Amino acid sequence: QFAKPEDAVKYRQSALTLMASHFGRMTPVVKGQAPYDAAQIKANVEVLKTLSALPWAAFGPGTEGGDARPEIWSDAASFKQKQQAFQDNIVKLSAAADAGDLDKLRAAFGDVGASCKACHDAYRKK
């Protein structure tokens, strides 16, 4: 759906910004600094689940650019494992949120965050 590589870069950066917000906005809740309302978190996590599927199709062949490392494309099976593992960690978070279980939510949130960082360490410049 992208006319130029820059359009795929803009798309993925936008998608990743919206993850970051739907992930990160739960930080005060998992820390107990903000109240836990199970319905509101269940709804937020379902938005995050949708968003978390979106960036990867905007790293298609030839869409080098942005802060993406060039190994995303030379190592496509490894990049695919990292995004699939991340999305699997999101499924854990969805199960916790759907269950209304704040201890499970806390644990799953930490696992998701570690999976963001695992990908960054391999595949994000800087």
Interaction site with ligand HEC (CB under 6 A): 9, 12-13, 16-17, 19-20, 23, 66-68, 82-83, 86, 112, 115-116, 119-120, 123-124
Task: Check residue 17 for interaction with a second copy (CB under 8 A).
Answer: yes
Residue 12 annotated in ligand binding: yes
Q: Which residues, in sequence order, are CB contacts of 119 under 8 Å at separation 6+?
A: 82, 83, 86
Query: Is the separation of the CB atoms in 92 and 108 below 8 Å?
Result: yes
DSSP tag of 113 = H
Helix axis angle for 38-52 and 5-24, nearest 10°, is 160
Residue 119 annotated in ligand binding: yes
According to CB under 8 A, which one of 4, 6, 25, 110 is a site residue for a second copy? 25
Q: How far is CA 46 from CA 8, 50, 120, in A?
A: 24, 6, 23
Looking only at residues 52 through 91 of this chain, which bind a second copy when binding is defined by CB under 8 A?
54
Size of the site for a second copy (CB under 8 A): 16
> How are the residues of the chain apportioned to helix, strand and coil, as percentages rounded to the nearest 5?
75, 0, 25
Between 24 and 32, whose beta carbon lies closer to a second copy?
24
**Binder of residue 83, out of a second copy, ligand HEC, none (CB less than 5 to 8 A by kind):** ligand HEC
Residue 103 annotated in ligand binding: no
Q: Contact positions toward a second copy, by CB under 8 A?
A: 1-2, 7, 10-11, 13-15, 17-18, 21, 24-25, 47, 50, 54
